[PDB]
Design a protein around this ligand. Sequence first.
Ligand SMILES: *[C@@](C)(CO)[C@](*)(O)[C@H](Cc1ccccc1)NC(=O)[C@H](Cc1ccc(OC)cc1)NC(=O)[C@@H](C)NC(=O)CN1CCOCC1
Ligand SMILES: [Mg+2]
Lengths: 240, 222, 233, 244, 231, 195, 235, 211
Amino acid sequence: GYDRALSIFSPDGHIFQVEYALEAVKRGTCAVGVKGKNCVVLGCERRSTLKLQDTRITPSKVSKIDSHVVLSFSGLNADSRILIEKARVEAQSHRLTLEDPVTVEYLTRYVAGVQQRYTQSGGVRPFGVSTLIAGFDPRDDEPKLYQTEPSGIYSSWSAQTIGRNSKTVREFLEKNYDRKEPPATVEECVKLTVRSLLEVVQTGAKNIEITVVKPDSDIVALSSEEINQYVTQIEQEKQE
Amino acid sequence: QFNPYGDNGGTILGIAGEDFAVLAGDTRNITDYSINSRYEPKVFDCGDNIVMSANGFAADGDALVKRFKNSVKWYHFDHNDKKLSINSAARNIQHLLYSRRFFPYYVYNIIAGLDEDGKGAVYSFDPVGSYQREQCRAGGAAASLIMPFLDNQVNFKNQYEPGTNGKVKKPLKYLSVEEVIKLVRDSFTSATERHIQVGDGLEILIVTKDGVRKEFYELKRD
Amino acid sequence: TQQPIVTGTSVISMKYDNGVIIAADNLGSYGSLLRFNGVERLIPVGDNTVVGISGDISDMQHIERLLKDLVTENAYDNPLADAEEALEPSYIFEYLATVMYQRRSKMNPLWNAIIVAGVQSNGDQFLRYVNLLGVTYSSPTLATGFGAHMANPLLRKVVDRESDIPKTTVQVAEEAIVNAMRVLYYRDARSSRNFSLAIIDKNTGLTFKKNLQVENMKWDFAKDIKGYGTQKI
Amino acid sequence: GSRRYDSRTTIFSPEGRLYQVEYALESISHAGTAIGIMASDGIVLAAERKVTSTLLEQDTSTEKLYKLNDKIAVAVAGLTADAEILINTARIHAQNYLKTYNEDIPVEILVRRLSDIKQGYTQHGGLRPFGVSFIYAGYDDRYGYQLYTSNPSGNYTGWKAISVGANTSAAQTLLQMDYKDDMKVDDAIELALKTLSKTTDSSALTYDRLEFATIRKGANDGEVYQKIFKPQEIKDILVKTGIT
Amino acid sequence: NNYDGDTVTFSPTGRLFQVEYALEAIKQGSVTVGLRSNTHAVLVALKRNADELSSYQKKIIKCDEHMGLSLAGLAPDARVLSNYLRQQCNYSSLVFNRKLAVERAGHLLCDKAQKNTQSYGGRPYGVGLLIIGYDKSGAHLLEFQPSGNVTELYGTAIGARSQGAKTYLERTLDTFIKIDGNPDELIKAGVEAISQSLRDESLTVDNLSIAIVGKDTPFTIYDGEAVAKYI
Amino acid sequence: MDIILGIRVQDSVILASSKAVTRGISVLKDSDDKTRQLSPHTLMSFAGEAGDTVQFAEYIQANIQLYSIREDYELSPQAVSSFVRQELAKSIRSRRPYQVNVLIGGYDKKKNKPELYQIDYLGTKVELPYGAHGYSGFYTFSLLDHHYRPDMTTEEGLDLLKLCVQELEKRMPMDFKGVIVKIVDKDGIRQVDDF
Amino acid sequence: DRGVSTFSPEGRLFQVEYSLEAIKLGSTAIGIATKEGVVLGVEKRATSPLLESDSIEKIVEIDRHIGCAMSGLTADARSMIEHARTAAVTHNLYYDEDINVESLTQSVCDLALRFGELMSRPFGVALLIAGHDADDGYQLFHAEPSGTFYRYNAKAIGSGSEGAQAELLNEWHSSLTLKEAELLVLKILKQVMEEKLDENNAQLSCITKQDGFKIYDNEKTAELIKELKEKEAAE
Amino acid sequence: TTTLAFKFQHGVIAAVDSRASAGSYISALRMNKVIEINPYLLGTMSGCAADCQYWERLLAKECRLYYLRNGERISVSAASKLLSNMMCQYRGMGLSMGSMICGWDKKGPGLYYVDEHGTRLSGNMFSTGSGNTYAYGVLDSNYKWDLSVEDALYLGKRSILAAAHRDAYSGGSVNLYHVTEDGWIYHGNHDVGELFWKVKEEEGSFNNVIG
Ligand SMILES: *[C@@](C)(CO)[C@](*)(O)[C@H](Cc1ccccc1)NC(=O)[C@H](Cc1ccc(OC)cc1)NC(=O)[C@@H](C)NC(=O)CN1CCOCC1
Ligand SMILES: [Mg+2]
């Protein structure tokens, strides 16, 4: 078998393949995650270079891993499918062996472990993908939002963004998001998620995707018109 | 058809004192109605103040002891010459036996020594690895002959204090090594009389804080 | 799992004051057929060990080759192969015992009963038995098959315990062995008159005697025996 | 040892791109243009054969349009040999699904499977990727008529109209201009051929330089029919639309 | 230069640079001395610490009751090779009821190290070993190099500044070989030998490591206050 | 385990499964639910060798749930039944086959039709208006053959099911401790708590 | 290119030496061993204020009697921790006892050099393994990707290691109490850290014979930080 | 063997005998048939002693690893399933193990029966072994959810006594356990010989037996 060590240390103590995998994430479309008091919202950019697209059948950016957990990403699209499939298999494997659905933290730890494994295994390259994993633990009303990256490190975030121009939207979130009082309602949480994407997106038409996840496996994706109403209200307040 | 097992007879006996332990076994080795050897040692000093005897099928018994002695050696290498405690040895032997759950070591194993508080300890095993610490145990051919005698003379079972008539039991004293060795010798002399596979010789290994000591006694050769 | 085809019967042996004696007949039986009459079942290993084998002859020939290869392998990169690092009876035995027990544990045994007789470096007598089950034991006298039932009782009258060994001379021990071989010829239907005898002494070394015959046999009394009860003529 | 001669086909550039995937796409950009147009009542697949000869046996020839099953077809852009390896795998996958569930495979599931195979060659194994871009035209009872594309990266996307191969930039602009949502198959047929006729590197677009196919519910009642156009039928539709 | 990228490549002069670089790791390692008489064999090792808060890296490893070694270079490689020796010593005992000859132990180490010098992908061992033991032919001392070369010696030393101790033993050859039935005097000669390789630092209680094996002496290691006697 | 029954009426599928679990000569449990929800509109009851039944059912459940998440779509009862059959047909020629018989009751939301599939451990699939496994059919099929109509209501289906259980309770030597009844229709799966 | 298991002309493995450079870039972790217990402390170093700092888990339990702190590529530590936990509990299964800290550390270090062309590269993380057993008492070990482990009375790893180690050189003595060690870790962490030390960006932990391995609450650490400030202002 | 365990208002009672047999020969008078997996988890043992000891001690290894990875005690449901999955690997290989996994977790007190077939049953009351039928007789007629800790402990004790008396392969002594939300509590070893005569006098039962 092909055993070649592709991810290796350089003289300065860097693993370039893992770092170049982060550059692939930087190229990917912007993804944002914001957790309110009783919900988490996942926002995703859709680049408008691709029109004549069939939005019914085109792979959505946010993917359900289980009925209570979702996963969005930034980076290589093909790479993300492999992590999502593995995560989905593990989610069912956990229910089958332990008789409880995975916690969001466990699922994140697994996906992060897969990414890490691909940084010190022979014949393979790292995943050019960073993920935002969000949801609610079974019989728990505390929101959960985690991030992973090609190196395999993961951590919990009150709010986070990844992908292209993520530096700008993170800048926005750092000054707008208050920890002492997070978005109390769904509206406020979605509004803040749309506002953050409007710093980067370009047009607020079909370029913004929003997915709201609430406790007890209550996951819904907002439509174009519903999002467009947020886009309208934000700019009308801005004209002042 | 090839039968991979055999029966080499013999009988073993372990008794735990207050600050000592004994492991005794007859020295006769047999197949069917023939004597192979009148003196074939069956109880071994395995190191770390532990004595061991695997009674039943001699080939499996020699293999197990040999493996446990090896396990003690590697325990020293791997854990900075740390002493293997009797409870740790017992657990280790369970895993040696269960590694063969589907092609068992056909032996009844006993180990004896001192626990980490200096008190006498005896551990008993079955062929597939179930074990337990006990105060006394006879294993092998004449085990059913000897055990009831030890229940009576070591644990004072069915013995009550005269005058009370079954109301007050005989109190559980602790026996001395000299008293224990008498029960061991009488146990084997009685077993030799009524069991054809038992006889020739008796070898006793006594374990104290000072070390392992041996005692040998002749038995009837018929 | 197999069955033995061509077989060798009893191997008998005993310790004496300065060494060990071992003996075995020269027959290779094919069931009830006394097929092969020139079979050597005592196989010397160096000048200090003799391995006596009973049971399946094809497996014996295999073991014979393992021992021959063992000597070859021991000499490799060994300047002291004919001195301090020469093969000992205890090394040869433990090797065979390891092989026998491994083969039985794979349910494919070497269908044999082996007695390794020899003298160690320190002059100590070595005599140990091993068989197809990997069962091992040692005794002042050892015998396989029928020898266990008929020879041991006779040899144990000479050396009944360990303390009788220094009192037993090579002449007495050899005489006992030779008498035992005669008794086996009387009573073992799978035995032969021709046999081999080996003596390993700590002083005189290895003496290997071939083409020995059972002699001084009692048959004359048979003429008087008539019928099976009531017949007089 | 062998390391000396390893090109390392599955590595990132400093910019975070996959070298071999990018170079495979460069290869595909020289391949004959293939166009897919999805309408309300069917799908059109049109493709240009590369500089043919008069001595090429066209009626028995197939380099662009392949049948995966009765409901799904693909247009190829790139190495034909590479495409046939993947096509046969996709045909097997569709049959495995049909054997397992006793239902025809949904279009996306088949597309995802092939795209995952392509992805694998970019992440592990040390082998070169498949120099192939597909346009998948198919139908199932969930989403109805569907167009997808996949490329050597293993990434796939859904489309109303799309082109792969040569001059996709020009072709996509022309499709984006004239395409409408309420469009029908007969109109889509005309759009596909007109787009090829303007983007082609050849002097003139003729029947012998084209492969053409439609997937229509224009089959007797609620069912779908695949039509791989014959040379004479391509010649007729070229006259009908007013190109020759 | 162009021929040191892997162990599978000879240089134009017939040299194996990866093996030579592995040999270099031994020279960087702390000094250890080996010497024997006809009755006993002794290892003396200068242990090295990382700093004042750290412990002193152990240098001597026991392989059997009658055999053991001291290391100089990559310690993990010594653990791998000593583990192999433990298994081989143990195979000889379990199968043949035979204590492994020290000479044969050297031949086994040579062959194990050699395989790593001729195959692609792997690397040579980066450690040197001094093996002592007492077998049927008396006391023995071996020097192992990861090139595969194993040498039986009366005395030797490996590690940094080992040339000083090696010269001393070369002078003292006729004296220390005759130290029979006197373990303390043989150790003294070893401690005096390793002292010739010291600069700036001296032999302290947690610095010095000594091992001995002999006729009626199992392989035992002396550390801590057990070696204060010899300081 | 022992008795599992199934009946497909006008607008629903009804599955009845015994509650008894026996080890040796002792009935360990009299409230065991011999069923697993494979998807919101698909229920599978099971009966066979001890241990194998639950392991197989949960394995099938995990696979269908995995499919549902991957495609964000519920498989038709027919597709699920075919998947289950293949697994059993695959299993029968394995080293140690799974000795499990199943009934799959589902409501096809596309066709708006209830569907009942009977599959035995060999992988023998049949679509039926009513079905059973083991000896259950010997007692109950005569009643079902007589009384069954395809336009029956759910309530009439339950009444005919009661008659089947009453016949089983009269003529079987075996005390199966009553049945848990579940209904599968357009609105999903629900349990009849009083039967 | 070149072999992964290649020796340099100086006699060092290139990859092992390069992994050590990655560890120098890691966040600071400090361990101090005393006769009343071993203290482990780490710099969390959150990359952003929105990152929930309590999810940063750089101090980890291996067993009840063994703890562990990490520095470097912390993702690499997860498989090492998993192996350590397995080795600890497996030995308890085989021997009905706690495993020696040294033996546990040795088991972890056996993984280190299992790389080649096994895993494709060495670990890019160093571990401070602290614990207690009956034989050798309270112990602190430093496990490197070279496969080497040194025992330490006190040790600092990470970006501010050489500065912290020099400080530990002066401050450590054999009669330190547990409370004194806690303040000493906090003091040195505060010295080498970029951002201002508080209960949210720094974490303490300890291992005692009685209570076993414990990670300190942010409320408990906050008091020790306040106690530190006052005693430094006292002179 | 005879073992039992049942849920009630104040947790779960677990009672076992202590006899071991090898044919008609009583090989052990006092064996521990309960394993303390953790302070809140118990495991009863019936069947092959070796199988019961090996696999339940291996379960404890796996339950301990769960705590280390998740920083949280394993549930009774999950623990029972891990064990049933082990049994399913050696499916048909000849293992003999009947066990009840007793404990307290978030859902309250938990009780699962698990056997060598891979069976896993949740319930309020179970009894395993050669004498389980005798124990069930006493349990079924005297069990309530509203039992006091004192009366519940006696019920499990008395139920084993019933089995020890009638079943030839059950006896020796009774080991009692009481599982609470603060963990399990050992309620001692009770010799059946002494307990029988005591219960006979105090309760008035076993009238047919002379004493
Ligand atoms: C009752 C006593 C018998 O049904 C009960 O099931 C016990 C359960 C048990 C559980 C854990 C520890 C001890 C006892 N079973 C036994 O005692 C089993 C019964 C049995 C016999 C034979 C079997 O093979 C088909 C299966 C089950 N006995 C044993 O396991 C017996 C073979 N082992 C021992 O007696 C081991 N002891 C003997 C004394 O030294 C320590 C080991
Ligand atoms: Mg007798």
